Amino acid sequence: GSMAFVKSGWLLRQSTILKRWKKNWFDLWSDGHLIYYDDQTRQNIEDKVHMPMDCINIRTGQECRDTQPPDGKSKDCMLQIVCRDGKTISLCAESTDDCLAWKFTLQDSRTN
Template sequence: MASLVTDKDDVILLKAGWIFRQKPLFKKWKRSWMVVSLGGNLKCFAKKRSSRPQTTFNLKLDLVSFKQGAQCRTLLPPPEVPTTCLIEMYFTGDRKLSLCAHDMDSAALWIQAITKAQSDKALPTPKYSRKNRTKEDALKEESQEQNKRQQKL
């Protein structure tokens, strides 16, 4: 798995894999590594091992609608890929993302992951462990404990 830069909402990955993405300028299909997280983010990477995404889309806030398969009438898929593998997503701000899976089964999995990421409620933020505490947090906790002790006396 790639070493990903994750936010607190991107802890659980729903789908990660290679998919064709159509470039907006020349309409050329390019293979990209994409990650859909339960937090609602869709991240596009140039390589599988990239640590920073090229683009990130927030599916919960920005996704207006999406089409799949035969509904994508203006798209032509890459060579030797059926039109049933097409996915077209429309975002706020007149942004559009055109994707094409390698086969019908993976297209169904991508669509399932996108709909789950869009509709699912955000997970509660996990409590930090002692290893992740900063010095400021430790000092705050110590001062709170001292205040409690003083109040008891």
């Protein structure tokens, strides 16, 4: 199996009960899975999404629906993974460039 990731890093994610923006650590696997954890120790797995099978769209910026950025931050930092079962994963990068780097990586993961 794989011993190394396509991309890893922090993103803020809007939570599924409280809808709070909270830090999570993300690993994108070469099998297509995006895994997110509470922190960068990889101890507390939260959830996953299989980009090829589950994702039907990736939105960024003003495209993102039903989600507003953390206070003070441009919505151009945001990206939203849209899944076929209606799950949306609303994300906020540190910068607009971090957002684009993830967008392009996640788009490619769908077709990889």
